[PDB]
Structure 1
Amino acid sequence: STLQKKIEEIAAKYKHSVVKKCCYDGARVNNDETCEQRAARISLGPRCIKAFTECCVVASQLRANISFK
C-alpha cells in the first residue's frame, strides 16, 4: 500500500463525489429550462457538466414514464 495508492484512492473519491453532486443537481426538476440550457450555465469541469446533463436527461425520462403495477 504505497503513498501513490492512497492518493489515487482519494482522487477517485473526489471525482466520484463531484459526479454525485452534479448528477443530483441536474436530476432536480426544472420545468422552465431544458437540460442543455441549464448545463450551459455551468462553469465547472467537463466531468461535472457530463454528470449534470446525463442525470438531467435521464431524470426527465423517468418522470415521464412513471407507472403503477
Structure 2
Amino acid sequence: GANLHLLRQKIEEQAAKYKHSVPKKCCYDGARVNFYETCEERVARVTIGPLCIRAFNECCTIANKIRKES
C-alpha cells in the first residue's frame, strides 16, 4: 500500500511552513484520507479562513499524490 511513513513525514514538513496552529491543523485535516472527493471538492467545503484553506488544499494535494504513487 501507500508509504505511510513518507506521507506523515511530508505532511509534517509542510505543516512546519505555517506559523500558527490553526493552519497547521487545517493541513493535517486536508491530509486525511477521503475516498469520495478530490482535494478541490474537499477544500471548497472549508470556510474557516484563507490561510486555513491554502494549508488544507496544499496538504491534501501532497497526501493524495503519495497515495496514488503507492
Which TM-score applies when normalising by structure 1?
0.69
Percent of paired sites with the same residue = 63
Q: Aligned pair count? A: 52
Structure 1 residue 33 displacement after superposition:
0.5
Structure 1 residue 62 displacement after superposition:
1.0
Gapped runs of 5+ residues in structure 1? 1-14
Moved over 3 A (4+): none
Gapped runs of 5+ residues in structure 2? 1-18
Aligned 1:45-64 pairs, distance under 5 A: 45-64=49-68
Structure 1 residue 44 displacement after superposition:
0.9
2:35 to 23, 31, 34: 31
Structure 1 residue 65 displacement after superposition:
2.1
Aligned 1:14-29 pairs, distance under 5 A: 15-29=19-33
Question: Which is bigger in relative contact order (C-alpha 8 A, separation at least 6)?
Answer: 2
